[PDB]
């Protein structure tokens with residue numbers, strides 16, 4: 071049972087949709103049980119986000135109608151260029167028209183009453199996948215293979231009520247998909263969306279189609295979950311920084327998870343978790359170079375003699391230093407810190423706390439600084455004679471995080487020392503270090519201006535060897 075997922079850019083145009091349809095058709099020769107998961111065409115979701123906001127504010131029925139023609143034509147052309155049989159094209163066009171009719175009504179709605187509930191947001195956003203899936207399923211039928219398009223809910227992904235960033239409540243993938251697969255039908259499931267227990271359309275957060283693939287792979291006890299993207303697997307680092315970056319052939323579930331940082335574009339660990347749990351191999355493949363071997367993610371670790379496997383970076387960040395003697399020992403300060411931050415929906419990327427307990431260092435994203443400062447002065451006040459426990463809160467802007475990653479780091483005596491000497495030699499100063507006890511990830515913080523020289527140095531010393 072192969073689960074094949076395709077991103078916005080993989081299905082970014084009619085031509086590209088047919089191309090993935092071929093990829094899928096070819097795989098149905100090998101594995102007889104294939105489920106595809108598809109994302110909205112590229113930039114569609116972004117357009118749906120923007121139009122959502124621009125319907126709430128500046129209510130303009132005509133501006134909506136213009137967007138509707140844009141979405142209509144992009145998809146009409148997608149059908150025209152992806153499917154050859156006029157009979158299929160007719161039937162898929164009918165589905166698309168039904169959807170746009172709906173999308174239009176809701177968008178007029180949010181404009182008319184000037185309200186955009188998270189429920190409504192989720193419904194609007196979902197139209198992306200609900201537009202691409204019938205096209206791909208049509209193309210798969212055009213290539214002479216049985217296929218129907220399904221929604222996340224219909225496929226058995228039942229979620230909580232947390233609109234926009236919903237988590238799975240329970241799975242019914244087997245009940246919903248096995249019957250289809252029995253008739254040799256290739257269901258193309260809309261990634262990114264789910265249904266709530268009561269039936270309302272839900273979204274799983276941006277990049278959610280990857281997660282959908284993982285859950286379906288999970289429910290079906292799949293042999294493999296194939297992520298089809300626009301790069302040849304996972305690279306040792308971002309090629310925009312180091313052009314000599316190379317494809318990583320094998321990756322452990324844990325190594326994969328540590329490469330995942332909050333924001334990217336990487337496969338969030340949430341996606342790895344189900345595969346890790348059942349030991350279902352993940353294969354990251356390049357849609358635009360389908361013969362590349364890509365990246366296999368498996369439990370069959372082994373000890374491939376190399377220590378450092380990859381280098382990750384995060385550039386949009388800020389470093390917050392929280393301090394006061396007031397804070398050492400059995401004080402709820404730590405609990406209170408992350409409470410105030412939890413309230414403010416402010417993500418914490420790094421935490422370091424040295425032996426004195428007089429200090430906690432955090433890295434958050436640039437845009438969350440004021441939100442965090444305001445959250446802290448809420449929980450506190452910012453002298454010792456006043457109740458207040460925190461004495462001084464410091465902010466450090468224009469920084470980055472670097473992570474050095476590899477299972478081979480575990481026993482590796484001297485690796486920390488070698489890493490940081492290299493950092494020094496590249497001209498960067500090490501502002502904060504965080505190495506968890508798994509020893510797989512050494513994360514550290516430097517000025518953003520030094521990011522490029524540092525990665526290039528680290529890459530040369532530990533990857534290029």
Ligand SMILES: N[C@@H](CC(=O)O)C(=O)O
Pocket residue numbers: 077078109110115116198199261262275276277278279280
């Ligand atoms: N519609 C989804 C596509 C994806 O997850 O790749 C999104 O914009 O996040």
